[PDB]
Design a protein around this ligand. Structure first.
Ligand code: PCW
Ligand code: PCW
Ligand code: PCW
Ligand code: PCW
Ligand code: P5S
Ligand code: LPE
Ligand code: LPE
Ligand code: LPE
Ligand code: LPE
Ligand code: LPE
Ligand SMILES: *[C@@H]1O[C@H](CO)[C@@H](O[C@@H]2O[C@H](CO)[C@@H](O)[C@H](O)[C@H]2NC(C)=O)[C@H](O)[C@H]1NC(C)=O
Ligand code: NAG
Ligand code: NA
Lengths: 173, 1273, 119
């Protein structure tokens, strides 16, 4: 159906990056009309600046150097009912590190009732030269290896002890 | 003896009166063989012609002293009249009374009354009789008047002993005959007609043998008193629990946040009448009669954005579904016990309260709908066994000659009969190849094949008819059956759509060599043979209920039609005419009553429909159950006695088998003859060390622990796994470690046991297969083929790793061994059932193939009228004219025989059957738009299938399961088959509890006041007073309702506080009197715990409701006052014994439940991996799906009872557009498409329902054995 | 819908005449959609005259022939649409009827009372 997965925080300089923004409706059988506006606050600054607006299957980009020619759409396609609002950076630079705000403007259509809603999501992006491996993966691999060696050592010790015991028992007979 | 036959003359009367006078001046049972209404003994011989049907003197010496006289008919039936003059007018010697006697005891009189009754019963089926029927009604009441006058003139009216009014069945005749005239000369038509229905009950008196059936039916009930009391008590306790938990929750609705014109929910609510404007303020799903339910917790249903959940308005289902009062909650609990549409209520309650409250439904389903039903069945079966045992206990106490001989020789037993059998099988297979989208070539091939088969069968008929004599030809029943089939096939050849399907009956000719098919044939024959009167009583009761419903509610259905239908037309189920009323009665007997009950209560009123429906349920279910038990035991023990050998006459199939054994073996031996003519202790120490390690308890515990961990790691893999990155990585590495550990275990077992013993063990084989699949998957993932289609399909097989727990737990192993030992006979009965269902599937394909297509407007799903678009071509023309138009077919239909098998499974379980029946009765032809109830009488097809392929099929399966499981218990020495040895020891220890002799009485304390308290608390009056106090407390909590005033709440609180004080005072008095001897009783300990529970729960509930905000905790804590009510069990003895039987059944039920839980866990993992992304429609929605483990187990517990499995299977039957979208994009996942896999889904659901049926049958037999052992010991 | 009305009613001159018209419809009468019409015709084939009607409330047309002697004497909720005639005159003799339309019932009710005035 629809799962609100958070965006990845780290982007590699010179490569491509996708900034997730997913905003599911509380009930999936309802009909809505959605658009978005993205605002960006760079590091060393404190003001959020609008960069793009997407509505009615056309993506509008504001006139800013840091994102011109480097941003394409990665949200929902072929609908006005947009539940995926993500964008794609095709060439990451060091000016793309900062705070991103994903404003979602949804207009539900009910029986004799229109409800105009709004959602805001915050994404923090860090631009690095080399991708850093996750701490969870590192510790999980290390703990799997230590569990392997611990179990093998325990099994070998028990095997040696019982082999000696049964050998002594056989020689006693 | 035979010479004791004299006429009743005035001298005899004078002698009898003199004897009576002598007895009075001075101031024993009659022979049952001579009792009235019995056949005259053969010892008396024949009767001379001159005194038959004449007043004769009494034969029984008991009445020889009193003034009686008897009359015998031409069939030797004895009638005992009274010698006292009738009304003091007509003497036995009067000619008028002589003629009245001659009329009364005669075959033609009874025949005339019977024909009158049947004609009247036929006449009561018309809902709008013509005007000329009044003369027929007058004739009927005149005939009844004549019969009653004859009876009164002969027997006398009321004064005497053997008189008209002494017979209970003559009271019905008198009531009917006074009602007729009173209604005629008193002028509600419905009430008068419903009283006219009483004439249908006179069938019991006129048809011989029905009074005995009714008496046995009444006798079976009187042994149910304790079970009824326990059922009422348990239903009341669960109703109180549900009233405490769910009061007012089904009134939650999604109310919109924005209201114009300064409006409020209070001001809006009192200006809303229709559903159209109720839809403008509350959220409705499309095409729904009720507002969507919601909750305030996180596990309840959610409201759309722009709405807030609020408790306001009415309850769902016309307001009839709620836990607001004790009566509505009791109705809900009875519905749950009978499991009628219970998944709808279950889903509503989970939506309104939270998914966490499925514990309530699990406990209620298990305790009520399984255990109470088991108790009812066991008690009725014990009653009928006792009555059957008593019954059998008292019972014991030239050229034509030449060529006809040649033709007779031509018909050879081992060859002609085998050829006929092969031809029958081939013809059945040929007919099973029909399907709807069939070419003309295939149709021609089938037609010529059927013609050839019919010609062959007719030729065989002619050869047998000219070989043997025609009189000798018609002496065997199978030959008559063959003749009927042949002539009917010829009649169809000369010319319907159903007459073609009657040749399918030739399959039953296989029962001459198939013993299990013969068993079903014998059961069906018994249903109309030795048990024909019981079936007749059942049919009469169904007829009476149908006509009563039609006369009571038929006009209300038409007059109040727009209260139950927006189109203002009659619904599918109603009582406006006789056929639909019978259909409703039959559906109630199938187990579905609440949905039609809602319509009945809407058109006619709650009380009348409630009374009628519960009468139908109780009486019809009792009669159906009695018929089921009679059929089962008769065809189980009475019919099977091994009187004759296994095919005593050499079976032609057996002769052919012997001839094959001769010929093939001889030919092979001769061919072999022709071919021959033409032509190191250290390794033993290692093995013993591995044996010591593997066998140790620590190793087994470790492996069990890791099996549990690896099985529980599968539940975390759901649609939200992408949010849990760390858990995902941890689970990947955990899968690696588990694979390593289990490979190490397999290697250790290899070295310890050796290849031979390891690979001749089935558990080791299963573990080997699981570890091989895991290792192949791991090596493919590490190599790089982690994205191949077959590799992913094999990765879906990790759901079977929980199977490693079967060999590790003793209880599951024992249950699995029992099932494996039961499989063989189950296979034979399965074969018989599959052939029987194949016949019906072929018939359904002949009737309904290609006729369920229809043109529908896809926006609202409404079928177009047949005025416009009557054809398929018009439908396609309109699809070019209009966009939202589709010529669509049902998913489950009779287009071929496999789909027919699926349809028959949905009809047999009564899950999804109504859609199929509506499509069947609306059908017209192929490429023709369906019309409403055009084929109305195709409901007969479904009723006949339900009867024969469910009732008789289940009778056969149960009858063989009983015998197989009895043999299984017999072979091992009578031990329990669902219990482990330690459980057996605990079972014996528990058994010694209920078989204790009375213990030492508690000795009274020496003190005076303590002694007075002792004799006060040890009296019976004290205990009965405590019991009535408990009943009063039960009533006090039954008073509580939703929306009650604050004064009500305060006074109820203070009454309950007073009850708590009284119970604590009783506890204190018992403590002071009995001292530490008070604790030597288990019930005293239970009461002490209950008192502590009451005080602590009251204080804690007050604390939560005052200095806290948590209604849920308040209700859960207040569920603690139920303990004061559970002490009513102490006073009741029968229900105490039944609860002891349940406690005895507990261990085996625990083992079977463990196995069921493991199976449902495996199926949940598979369902999560398969159906997590299908379209949300039918029974799959935002709360009941396979997206997470909890949701999947919620869905699977529901269909363990089979409730709603069709609605879950329907979204999986979508596999191509426009039903689904293969390229559907799901945000937050890389999975594409919302389509299903119809083969995987069908296998999944059919296999699960079959396995659930088998396991639940195991639970049934466990509980029944526990009851039979306990109650008969 | 069974409309229960007296076939013929005799009322003394100078007294009041209650005209009982009752119907049984299994649906509740709501005043927004319930329709009641009362005509007066001098004969069976004569012209019918609107004098009393109900659309949302009791509507009195106040015909000149009846002066102000026509009042409603019933309760639509209680299925009582009876009218009454104060001080019956000899000219009041005729045929009186009550058409009834109670949604959501499909059928239309019809009643007839032959009011007769004697000396
Ligand atoms: C052979 C013989 C077999 C047995 C024959 C007799 C069986 C049953 C007799 C039942 C008699 C019931 C009389 C009811 C009288 C009545 O009119 O009752 C009214 C109350 C309250 O209605 P209300 O004002 O809230 O409705 C408001 C309207 N609304 C709901 C649309 C919003 O109805 C309620 O409480 C509903 C009470 C429902 C009780 C069902 C109990 C379970 C049934 C069977 C148990 C097993 C046997
Ligand atoms: C007490 C008794 C209880 C009985 C319980 C029964 C439960 C229900 C059982 C089965 C239901 C589903 C059966 C299948 C449904 C129909 C599916 C269907 O429509 O399939 C169509 C296809 C053929 O399509 P096509 O010609 O367009 O293909 C292209 C051909 N070209 C290329 C030449 C153009 O057919 C196929 O593949 C068919 C392949 C499978 C055939 C299965 C036949 C039925 C087998 C067993 C039924 C009995 C239960 C057995 C287990 C008992 C435990
Ligand atoms: C949900 C919210 C509410 C939760 C409530 C939970 C608690 C409720 C019940 C659980 C505990 C039930 C205990 C039953 C014990 C039965 C038994 O086996 O009792 C054993 C002894 C009998 O002692 P005795 O009468 O022979 O006197 C001996 C006098 N000597 C020492 C001078 C020789 O119990 C004794 O000693 C006295 C034991 C007293 C136990 C605590 C009572 C409350 C404070
Ligand atoms: C929603 C309701 C929420 C509130 C519920 C409150 C009640 C629930 C739980 C409280 C349980 C309190 C303790 C019960 C067992 C008491 C006990 O000490 O029981 C002992 C008996 C065995 O001794 P006996 O009874 O043969 O007496 C021997 C002496 N003589 C022969 C002289 C009579 O244990 C047995 O049978 C085992 C009986 C087990 C019964 C479990 C009931 C669970 C409900
Ligand atoms: O039955 C005879 C034996 C049973 O086992 P045991 O350990 O020899 O004897 C145990 C017994 N309690 C005892 O005291 O006497 O069991 C046998 O004697 C059965 C015959 C086994 C023959 C096959 C053995 C093959 C070698 C074992 C498997 C090697 C697998 C290697 C895989 C690769 C390396 C890990
Ligand atoms: C066999 C017996 C019958 C089947 C029993 C299966 C085990 C019982 C299976 O129960 C699953 C439910 O508890 C899931 O619903 P919950 O409300 O618990 O989910 C809460 C989720 N959040 C809100 C915390 C995220
Ligand atoms: C992988 O782990 C294997 C261990 O759990 C085996 O433990 P043991 O069963 O060897 O524990 C000691 C038991 N013996 C060797 C003393 C019999
Ligand atoms: C006897 C046989 C017993 C077999 C037992 C197999 C393992 C039985 C394990 O049962 C509990 C798990 O299924 C719970 O899985 P969940 O994913 O619902 O729990 C975590 C939920 N969050 C934290 C991800 C939301
Ligand atoms: C759904 C079906 C299951 C519902 C719940 C069943 C009752 C569940 C309640 O407990 C059942 C147990 O009593 C089963 O037997 P025991 O384990 O107590 O046997 C004695 C102890 N040993 C021998 C094992 C050590
Ligand atoms: C014994 C069995 C024990 C386990 C029983 C089943 C537990 C089952 C526990 O399930 C927990 C969650 O998976 C449920 O997730 P929901 O469907 O509520 O979606 C949550 C979505 N957000 C809010 C996170 C975005
Ligand atoms: C299928 O149904 C239609 C219903 O109209 C049949 O009627 C024909 O309809 C067309 C278009 O309205 C007319 O031009 C023809 O004259 C109609 N036929 C007749 C009988 O006059 C149509 O014939 C049907 N077709 C089939 C295959 O039965
Ligand atoms: C409140 O309701 C009144 C009408 O009763 C309306 O005139 C007024 O504007 C409303 N005021 C607000 C604050 O909604
Ligand atoms: Na139902």
């Amino acid at each position: 159906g629809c799962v609100e997965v958070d965006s990845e925080t780290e982007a590699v300089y010179g490569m491509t990056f996708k900034i997730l923004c997913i905003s599911c409706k509380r009930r999936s059988e309802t009909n809505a009309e959605t658009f978005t506006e993205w605002t960006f606050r760079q590091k060393g600054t404190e003001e959020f600046v609008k960069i793009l607006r997407y509505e009615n299957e056309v993506l509008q980009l504001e006139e800013d150097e840091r994102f011109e020619g480097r941003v394409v759409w990665n949200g929902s396609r072929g609908t006005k009912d947009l539940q995926d609002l993500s964008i794609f950076i095709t060439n990451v630079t060091y000016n793309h590190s900062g705070d991103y705000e994903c404003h979602v403007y949804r207009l539900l259509f009910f029986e004799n009732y229109e409800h105009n809603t709004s959602v805001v999501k915050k994404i923090h992006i860090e631009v690095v030269d080399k991708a850093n491996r996750d701490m969870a993966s590192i510790v999980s691999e290390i703990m799997m290896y230590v569990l392997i060696v611990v179990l093998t050592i325990w099994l070998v010790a028990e095997m040696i002890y019982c082999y000696k015991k049964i050998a002594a028992a056989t020689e006693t007979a | 003896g035979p010479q004791s036959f004299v006429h009743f003359t005035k001298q005899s009367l004078a002698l009898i009166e003199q004897r009576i006078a002598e007895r009075k001046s001075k101031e024993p049972k009659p022979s049952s063989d001579l009792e009235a209404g019995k056949q005259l003994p053969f010892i008396y011989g024949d009767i001379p012609p001159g005194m038959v049907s004449e007043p004769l003197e009494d034969l029984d010496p008991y009445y020889a002293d009193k003034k009686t006289f008897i009359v015998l008919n031409k069939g030797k039936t004895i009638f005992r009249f009274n010698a006292t003059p009738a009304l003091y007018m007509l003497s036995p010697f009067s000619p008028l009374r002589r003629i009245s006697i001659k009329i009364l005891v005669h075959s033609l009189f009874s025949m005339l009354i019977m024909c009158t009754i049947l004609t009247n019963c036929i006449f009561m089926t018309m809902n709008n009789p013509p005007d000329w029927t009044k003369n027929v009604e007058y004739t009927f009441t005149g005939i009844y008047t004549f019969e009653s006058l004859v009876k009164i003139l002969a027997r006398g009216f009321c004064v005497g002993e053997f008189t008209f009014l002494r017979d209970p069945w003559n009271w019905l005749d008198f009531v009917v005959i006074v009602f007729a005239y009173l209604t005629e000369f008193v002028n509600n038509v419905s009430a008068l007609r419903t009283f006219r229905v009483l004439r249908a009950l006179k069938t019991i008196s006129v048809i011989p043998g029905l009074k005995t059936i009714v008496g046995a039916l009444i006798q079976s009930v009187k042994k149910l008193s304790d079970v009824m009391i326990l059922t009422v008590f348990c239903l009341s306790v669960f109703a109180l629990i549900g009233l405490q938990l769910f009061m007012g929750n089904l009134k939650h609705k999604c109310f919109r946040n924005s209201l114009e014109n300064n409006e409020t929910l209070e001001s809006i609510m009192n200006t809303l009448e229709s559903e159209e404007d109720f839809r403008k303020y509350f959220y409705y799903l499309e095409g729904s009669k009720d507002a969507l339910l919601c909750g305030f917790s996180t596990d309840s249903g959610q409201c759309p954005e722009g709405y807030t959940c609020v408790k306001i308005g009415r309850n769902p289902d016309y307001g009839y579904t709620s836990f607001d009062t004790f009566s509505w909650a009791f109705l809900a609990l009875f519905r749950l016990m009978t499991q009628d549409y219970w998944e709808n209520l279950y889903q509503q309650t989970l939506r309104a309260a939270g998914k966490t409250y499925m514990i309530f439904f699990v406990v209620v389903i298990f305790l009520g709908s399984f255990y109470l039903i088991n108790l009812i069945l066991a008690v009725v079966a014990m009653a009928y066994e006792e009555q059957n045992q008593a019954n059998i206990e008292e019972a014991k106490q030239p050229y034509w000659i030449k060529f006809k001989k040649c033709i007779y020789f031509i018909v050879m037993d081992p060859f002609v009969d085998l050829a006929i059998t092969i031809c029958i099988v081939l013809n059945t297979l040929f007919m099973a190849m029909e399907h709807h989208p069939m070419t003309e070539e295939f149709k021609n091939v089938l037609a010529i094949g059927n013609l050839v088969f019919t010609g062959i069968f007719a030729a065989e008929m002619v050869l047998k008819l000219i070989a043997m004599d025609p009189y000798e030809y018609f002496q065997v029943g199978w030959n008559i059956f063959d003749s009927l089939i042949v002539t009917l096939s010829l009649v169809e050849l000369f010319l319907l759509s159903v007459l073609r399907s009657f040749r399918l009956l030739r399959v039953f000719k296989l029962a001459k060599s198939w013993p299990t098919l013969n068993m079903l044939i014998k059961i069906i024959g018994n249903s109309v043979g030795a048990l024909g009167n019981l079936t007749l009583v059942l049919a009469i009761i169904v007829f009476i209920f149908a006509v009563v419903g039609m006369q009571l509610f038929g006009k209300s259905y038409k007059e109040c039609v727009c209260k139950i239908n927006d189109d203002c037309t009659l619904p599918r189920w109603h009582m406006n005419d006789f056929f639909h009323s019978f259909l409703i009665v039959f559906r109630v007997l199938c187990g579905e009553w609440i949905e039609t009950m809602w319509d009945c209560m809407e058109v006619a009123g709650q009380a009348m429909c409630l009374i009628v429906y519960m009468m139908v349920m109780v009486i019809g279910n009792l009669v159906v159950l009695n018929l089921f038990l009679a059929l089962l035991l008769s065809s189980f023990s009475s019919d099977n006695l091994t009187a004759i050998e296994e095919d005593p006459d050499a079976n032609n199939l057996q002769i052919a088998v012997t001839r094959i054994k001769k010929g093939i073996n001889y030919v092979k031996q001769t061919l072999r003859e022709f071919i021959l003519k033409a032509f190191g202790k250290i390794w033993w120490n290692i093995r013993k060390t591995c044996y010591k390690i593997v066998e140790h308890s620590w190793f087994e515990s470790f492996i069990v622990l890791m099996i549990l961990l690896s099985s529980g790691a599968l539940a975390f893999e759901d649609i939200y796994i992408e949010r849990k990155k760390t858990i995902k990585i941890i689970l990947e590495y955990a899968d690696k470690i588990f694979t390593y550990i289990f490979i190490l275990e397999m290697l250790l077992k290899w070295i310890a046991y050796g290849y031979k013993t390891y690979f001749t063990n089935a558990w080791c084989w299963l573990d080997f297969l699981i570890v091989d699949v895991s290792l192949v998957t791991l090596v493919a993932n590490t190599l790089g083929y982690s994205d191949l289609g077959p590799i992913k399909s094999l990765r879906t097989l990790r759901a079977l790793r929980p199977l490693r727990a079967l060999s590790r737990f003793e209880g599951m192993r024992v249950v699995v061994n029992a099932l494996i030992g039961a499989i063989p006979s189950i296979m034979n009965v399965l074969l018989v059932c599959l052939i029987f269902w194949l016949i019906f599937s072929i018939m359904g394909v002949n009737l309904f193939a290609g006729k369920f297509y229809e043109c529908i407007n896809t926006t609202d799903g409404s079928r177009f009228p047949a005025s416009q678009v009557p054809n398929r071509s018009e439908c396609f023309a309109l699809m070019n004219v209009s966009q939202n138009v589709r010529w669509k077919n049902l998913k489950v239909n009779f287009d071929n025989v496999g789909l027919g098998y699926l349809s028959l499974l949905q009809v047999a379980t009564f899950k999804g059957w109504t859609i199929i029946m509506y499509a069947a009765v609306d059908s017209v032809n192929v490429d023709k738009q369906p019309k409403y109830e055009y084929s109305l009488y195709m409901y007969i097809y479904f009723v006949v299938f339900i009867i024969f392929g469910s009732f008789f099929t289940l009778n056969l399966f149960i009858g063989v399961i009983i015998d197989n499981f009895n043999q299984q218990k017999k072979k091992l020495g009578g031990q329990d088959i669902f219990m482990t040895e330690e459980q057996k020891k605990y079972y014996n220890a528990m058994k010694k509890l209920g078989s204790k002799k009375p213990q030492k009485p508690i000795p009274r304390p020496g003190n005076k006041i303590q002694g007075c308290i002792f004799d006060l608390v040890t009296n019976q009056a004290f205990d009965i007073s405590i019991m009535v106090l408990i009943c009063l407390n039960m009533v006090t909590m039954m008073v509580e309702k939703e929306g009650q005033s604050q004064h009500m709440t305060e006074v109820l609180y203070w009454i309950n506080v007073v009850f708590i004080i009284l119970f604590t005072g009783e506890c204190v008095l018992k403590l002071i009197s009995l001292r530490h001897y008070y604790f030597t009783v288990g019930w005293n300990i239970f009461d002490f715990v209950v008192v502590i529970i009451s005080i602590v729960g009251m204080f804690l509930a007050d604390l939560i409701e005052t200095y806290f905000v948590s209604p849920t905790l308040f209700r859960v804590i207040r569920l603690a006052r139920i303990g004061r009510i559970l002490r009513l069990v102490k006073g009741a003895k029968g229900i105490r014994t039944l609860l002891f039987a349940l406690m005895m059944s507990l261990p085996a039920l625990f083992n079977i439940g463990l196995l069921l839980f493991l199976v449902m866990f495996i199926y949940a993992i598979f369902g999560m991996s398969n159906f997590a992304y299908v379209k949300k429609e039918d029974g799959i929605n935002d709360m009941f799906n396979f997206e997470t483990f909890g949701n999947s187990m919620i869905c699977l517990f529901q269909i363990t009872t089979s409730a709603g499995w069709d609605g879950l299977l329907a979204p999986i039957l979508n596999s191509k557009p426009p039903d689904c979208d293969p390229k559907k994009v799901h945000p937050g996942s890389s999975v594409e498409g919302d389509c299903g896999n119809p083969s995987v889904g069908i296998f999944y659901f059919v296999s699960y329902i079959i396995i659930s049926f088998l396991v639940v049958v195991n639970m049934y037999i466990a509980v029944i054995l526990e009851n039979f052992s306990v109650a008969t010991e | 819908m069974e409309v229960t009305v007296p076939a013929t009613l005799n009322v003394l001159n100078g007294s009041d005449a209650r005209l009982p018209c009752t119907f049984n419809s299994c649906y509740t009468v709501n005043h927004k959609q319930f329709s009641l019409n009362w005509t007066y015709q001098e004969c069976n084939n004569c012209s019918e005259e609107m004098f009393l009607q109900f659309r949302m409330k009791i509507i009195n047309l106040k015909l000149e022939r009846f002066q102000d002697r026509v009042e409603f004497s019933g309760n639509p909720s209680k299925y009582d649409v009876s009218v009454m005639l104060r001080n019956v005159q000899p000219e009041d003799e005729g045929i009186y009827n009550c058409y009834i339309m109670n949604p959501p019932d499909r059928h239309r009710g019809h009643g007839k009372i032959h009011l007769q005035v004697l000396m």
